[PDB]
Amino acid sequence: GTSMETFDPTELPELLKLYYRRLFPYSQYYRWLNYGGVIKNYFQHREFSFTLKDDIYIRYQSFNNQSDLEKEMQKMNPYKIDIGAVYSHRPNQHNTVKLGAFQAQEKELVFDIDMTDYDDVRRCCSSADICPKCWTLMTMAIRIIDRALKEDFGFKHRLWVYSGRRGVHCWVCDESVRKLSSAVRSGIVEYLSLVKGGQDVKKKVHLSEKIHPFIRKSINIIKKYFEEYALVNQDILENKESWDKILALVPETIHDELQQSFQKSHNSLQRWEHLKKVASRYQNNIKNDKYGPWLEWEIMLQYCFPRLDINVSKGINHLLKSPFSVHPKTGRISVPIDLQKVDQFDPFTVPTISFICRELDARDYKKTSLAPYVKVFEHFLENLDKSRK
Numbered sequence: 001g002t003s004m005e006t007f008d009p010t011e012l013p014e015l016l017k018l019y020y021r022r023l024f025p026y027s028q029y030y031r032w033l034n035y036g037g038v039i040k041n042y043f044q045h046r047e048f049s050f051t052l053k054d055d056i057y058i059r060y061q062s063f064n065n066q067s068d069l070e071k072e073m074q075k076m077n078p079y080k081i082d083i084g085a086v087y088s089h090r091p092n093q094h095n096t097v098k099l100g101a102f103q104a105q106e107k108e109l110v111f112d113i114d115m116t117d118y119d120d121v122r123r124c125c126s127s128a129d130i131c132p133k134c135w136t137l138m139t140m141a142i143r144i145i146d147r148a149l150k151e152d153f154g155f156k157h158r159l160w161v162y163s164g165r166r167g168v169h170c171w172v173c174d175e176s177v178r179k180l181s182s183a184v185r186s187g188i189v190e191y192l193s194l195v196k197g198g199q200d201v202k203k204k205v206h207l208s209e210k211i212h213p214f215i216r217k218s219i220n221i222i223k224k225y226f227e228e229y230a231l232v233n234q235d236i237l238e239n240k241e242s243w244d245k246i247l248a249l250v251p252e253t254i255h256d257e258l259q260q261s262f263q264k265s266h267n268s269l270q271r272w273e274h275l276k277k278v279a280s281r282y283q284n285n286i287k288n289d290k291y292g293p294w295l296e297w298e299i300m301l302q303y304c305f306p307r308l309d310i311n312v313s314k315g316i317n318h319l320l321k322s323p324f325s326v327h328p329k330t331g332r333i334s335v336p337i338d339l340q341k342v343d344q345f346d347p348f349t350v351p352t353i354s355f356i357c358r359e360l361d362a363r364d365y366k367k368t369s370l371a372p373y374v375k376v377f378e379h380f381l382e383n384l385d386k387s388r389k
């Protein structure tokens, strides 16, 4: 695959200047972080962090209103913009605050799903690269996590954003969610988590006998993709070097039976069908006479289910890349992802700052390929607006 790295980043300053002057959607961005103006000082107490040239960054930047933010962004033309928590005081006054009183109080619940966490189950790309094959992992992650957040937790205001390179972020923005404690956020991650363990750990998925609906519904999403993704594109049972990795996920007592059936068959599709049958006949507990799909599902989960960094989601003060910021090393915009078109999302066609600046002079983002992504954002804002009395 490819890491999408910009070959010549010396173009970035003049492109950023144009982007921040004419294309960055300031009015919509402020409408987001002002949250209807119904909490006093909510925008003014938000931390922003700007990264400049040479990875030099400034923390605890804050702004009075939309005009202020516009002017500072156009003055500093940052390479990166990170959004942090809403604080007890204006961040840009935190040094006037007596020690201990400056506290992060609220922030969106965020997830950060990164392709490198799947390195142990990708056959297509080296660690730093992505390709059209492994991007399906992100498609599944979005569907699995968005459905749970929406249906199981009742979170209504969920913004999925491209990372600009190798992953996706989710911003959960409900007012009740912004107030949740670190402990509660950790509990949400634990509910959503099924793949656990480092490279130290060979088998990373262990299912209980009793199936919770979250596991069933997640498996059912994976099943829509698994044949094309895992058996065709990844070809996970192509040969012994690869199918041995799967046998390491199932009891040793069925390896020989599976080894021999893998050698008699000719493709990953056939070999998966044998695995499902042998697995469904394994007696997990010599006591009872109960059989089922747990091994099959554990394999599918280990290969297809997202890995969730609990630190990202539990920290109230965590800085995360801003929607509509520019990835300095790829040029790609951190665009919102239309959930209704998740299967059509291609990171390789996400607008770059170079591309949309060329479109601009050939007035407004509506003249450019950024426009449909602003409309996705606007729908998210409309749903937030509808929720307020």
Ligand SMILES: [Zn+2]
Binding pocket: 001, 122, 124, 125, 129, 130, 131, 132, 133, 134, 135
């Ligand atoms: Zn790949």
